[PDB]
Amino acid sequence: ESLNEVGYDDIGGCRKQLAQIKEMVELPLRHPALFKAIGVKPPRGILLYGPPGTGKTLIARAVANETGAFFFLINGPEIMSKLAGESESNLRKAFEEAEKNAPAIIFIDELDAIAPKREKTHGEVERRIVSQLLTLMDGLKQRAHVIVMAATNRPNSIDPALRRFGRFDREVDIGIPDATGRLEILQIHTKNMKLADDVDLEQVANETHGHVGADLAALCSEAALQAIRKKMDAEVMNSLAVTMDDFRWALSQSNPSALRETVVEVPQVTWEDIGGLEDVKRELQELVQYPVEHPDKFLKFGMTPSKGVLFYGPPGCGKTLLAKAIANECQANFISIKGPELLTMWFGESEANVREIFDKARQAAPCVLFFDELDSIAKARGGGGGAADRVINQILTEMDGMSTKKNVFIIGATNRPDIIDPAILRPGRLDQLIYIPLPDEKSRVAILKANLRKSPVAKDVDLEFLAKMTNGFSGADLTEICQRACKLAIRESIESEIRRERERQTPVPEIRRDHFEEAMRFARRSVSDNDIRKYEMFAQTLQQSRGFGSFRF
Amino acid sequence: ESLNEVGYDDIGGCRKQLAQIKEMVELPLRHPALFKAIGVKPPRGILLYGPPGTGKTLIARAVANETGAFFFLINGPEIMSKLAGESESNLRKAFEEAEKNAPAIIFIDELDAIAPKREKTHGEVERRIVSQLLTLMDGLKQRAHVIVMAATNRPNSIDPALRRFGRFDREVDIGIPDATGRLEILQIHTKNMKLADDVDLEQVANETHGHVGADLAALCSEAALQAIRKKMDAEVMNSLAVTMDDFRWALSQSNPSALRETVVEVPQVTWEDIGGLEDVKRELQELVQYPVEHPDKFLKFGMTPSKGVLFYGPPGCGKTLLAKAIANECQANFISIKGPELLTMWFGESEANVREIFDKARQAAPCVLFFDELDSIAKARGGGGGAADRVINQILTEMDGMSTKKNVFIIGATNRPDIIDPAILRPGRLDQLIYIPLPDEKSRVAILKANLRKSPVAKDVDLEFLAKMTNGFSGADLTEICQRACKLAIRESIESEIRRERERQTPVPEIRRDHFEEAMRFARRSVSDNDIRKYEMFAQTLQQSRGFGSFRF
């Protein structure tokens, strides 16, 4: 009724995506007179594909309301609920009603329900509703000024005839709300929750991971009810204090759904967490930023931008936080495909779900498609074989497919660079290889400073001394130095509280440098001298300058 | 009629889960005025998923009755029983009836029947009743003060569109009744059974395993009929004496259904059944208790709590009773995933049934997810392969997926620590490894005392002498020392009864110390000196301190 009015301010979790919606379906609706005189063909379907509970209904209702177009809702399960032959009547009546109110927004939510994948559709009446929808979008694409968007979980779950042109051509990935998106969603949902000012709304927004807007509403709901069941007695009702302990309890008891849906997000590493690596930094800038931030020069000199690069080197030396950093300078959506995902695709024989990954990269462009641990499969069949894995081959196919445009950069990184498919290293594919060595003294002092950031560390601790002592230490070992110093600070502080409460009732404010000594006593240089030796042998396998130096004339 | 009134006292076998129901659907029903003034969004579906016959109908009816909400039941097979067209009419009639009695509890038991897995639904009417149920749950989520719970066997057997938000967002694992839960259920079902005071009601509650409340009712029933068929003649009917022999007979001929349904329970090991292992005990406290009992300290010093630990060591040295012990101090539910279960997933190619275990840990949080014998698969393909097994990779996937919140701790323990996936031991994954050695003198005297507990053992026998003579004996060797000493006492006692009855009619009160020589003659040190040698070699493989000792400045 009067509640649904929903506007742009009431929508959070999507800024670029909602702006994309506005540039798609507000100019040809608010002022279509300026539109068709040019001769430009209007969109006639905006297939909003995203995880469930992102409030896609609220998004489309806000876009319709702040345009004035008559938002008419077609509930999917409602259509499938009605008997055979009345669902087709309801669909045609819906489109006919919406062409009356000529600026209209038809929003067929749960398009999976009425029109799933064509192999799933079983009955003929369940194939006369998909067909009726198809002919409706054709006839209302060619006529009557109505624009029909729909909300789906994924773009394989829709009948492929709907993605054909004229029908649902456009797609908008509503996706997971990111950290600032979760901030906006918490502010909207906590407009009236009247916290006790202990809640940041920012720290919780950072430590909610895999939480769509419905999950954030559930989080605020359970936190408010923890406040209610903590008060436990009408004026005392208005004096409820939703304190940060309630939000931490709600987080500890929140079941999120948006995990296993990979998140595209500009990461926060800023090239100072990964210090050093200066020549690698220059190569990554020249490979990512220069194609996208200075693309005129590339088309001037005729150079095609490289499709991909391939890190390699010792494990846990700052390879993942070295593609996040360059995705942060590029301000590109960062898509990390971890090794277990590639392995899962290699074991289920579902080698066609990496088409979906590259497609998601295409929509989320510009990208840094960090195929982390690209040699997981080659380790998993160490040995009858020899090359060309199941899904490595599909990675090659969808890597050769996309053009040097669309600014999608694959930065797949391998611990073992020799067991990988040698067809990956062909030109056009991940031809540039970049050795990521063990941290240099600047690099590991930056690593030690970054791992100890947000942790209360002393002033008399000499972190450059630590970084100067540690030569062969990989980045992961330098984390485990700090995560055994923080852990021992935990032990000492808790033991302090324990012998205080049992005796003094009846503090270790910071990680003192005597914790960084007995924590450093358990220091394991995890990468051997024979691992980095082989990585150097592969590195100068890729160095065959050999006499063409001082090529003068 | 008047019989169904059922209350909280009449429900047993679930305290935390029933209290969760109290905090879910008792506050927003008795006093909803205190609720919606805050702006908190009410629950609108409580998917009570649990094994069949846990009295879920009785649970929902008791919660409604002690609330006053109009419990109205939608029997699943009743809906599927009516012909096509009026099953949907019965659904709409049910919802429109319950929105009249504005505080109401719809309880659609056997939601598997009306809405199974979406692939399983075959006819179109079986897909118009799920769709009708979906649109009804949407319309009654957004309106009419009414809340709709439904009992299922598992959360895979339900159509995935029901678990979407607005629809069945909440889930409650009613689960297996534990030992004290079985005590409560036994007392409820044995209120009027008028025992002979020989029945403990507690010992029988301990030795019924995998028994849901209906199985306990069947147990009391078969015991009562054994009393009836032991009496075998109206006043003699009132003088029936249900003696513990009847309960033992009924327990020996009870067919339980709740086996193969993994039980979550705070176990009973109390950390002195496994004596010794003091440094291991301190690491386990620092890893489990300190993250969950003192969690503000971790967020102060910025430490993310470690996701999991990996025991290793000689077989049967107290590794399972070393994770139950820490799950007991933590008061966390304990989920043991034995090696045959992982192997069963590796052979059936059902690598996606370990997603269900991690989900079960998430609902049953905080947990100790003891993947006992994590190297079952690697032993089962000892040898073209090399690493990264079918379901070990899925364990890595849903181990990396969940955050350091939710307090789910994985303690997967391996006899052979080198054949396991090296990707398990990466940081973030089961990074801590804890060698579990053969018992020391304190540890094996505690093992001997615990194995001989509840068994009548003499005073003159020195268990410190036994623990002092056994050096290379693993804990299992010490069990077969005591389970051959008990067995010799059995043999000698039964032989005494035999030679008494055949001659004296026509006692060995305890395990005397002259049986502990005959048992100890067959003393098998089952773990060799070259097995523990390899485990210590792996231990120093994990000890690479190497000169960073005496790190001063």
Author numbering:
A (entry chain A), B (entry chain B): 196 to 428, 439 to 588, 593 to 715, 727 to 773
Give passages from the manuscript.
Human p97/VCP (valosin-containing protein) belongs to the type II AAA+ (ATPase Associated with various cellular Activities) protein family, which has two AAA+ ATPase domains. p97 comprises an N-terminal domain (NTD), two ATPase domains, D1 and D2, containing conserved Walker A and B motifs, and an unstructured C-terminal tail. Six p97 monomers form a functional complex, featuring a double-ring structure based on the association of D1 and D2.
We reconstructed the 3D density maps of the p97R155H dodecamer complex at 3.34 Å resolution and the p97R155H-p47 complex at 4.30 Å. The two p97R155H hexamers are oppositely packed against their D2 rings with a D6 symmetrical arrangement. The nucleotide-binding pockets are empty in the p97R155H dodecamer. For p97R155H dodecamer, we did not find densities that could be assigned to p47. Our cryo-EM density map of the p97R155H dodecamer was able to show an apparent density of the partial C-terminal tail (residues Q764 to F773). The crystal structure of the C-terminus up to P774 of an engineered p97 variant has also been determined, but at a weak signal level. This is because in our p97R155H dodecamer, the C-terminal tail is sandwiched by the two hexameric D2 rings, limiting its mobility and allowing visualization of high-resolution details. Packing occurs via largely polar-polar interactions between the D2 α helices and a hydrogen-bonding network of the C-terminal residues (D749, E756, Q760, Q764, and R766). π-stacking forces between the aromatic side chains of the C-terminal tails and the D2 α helices (F674, F682, F768, F771 and F773) also contribute to the packing of the two p97R155H hexamers.
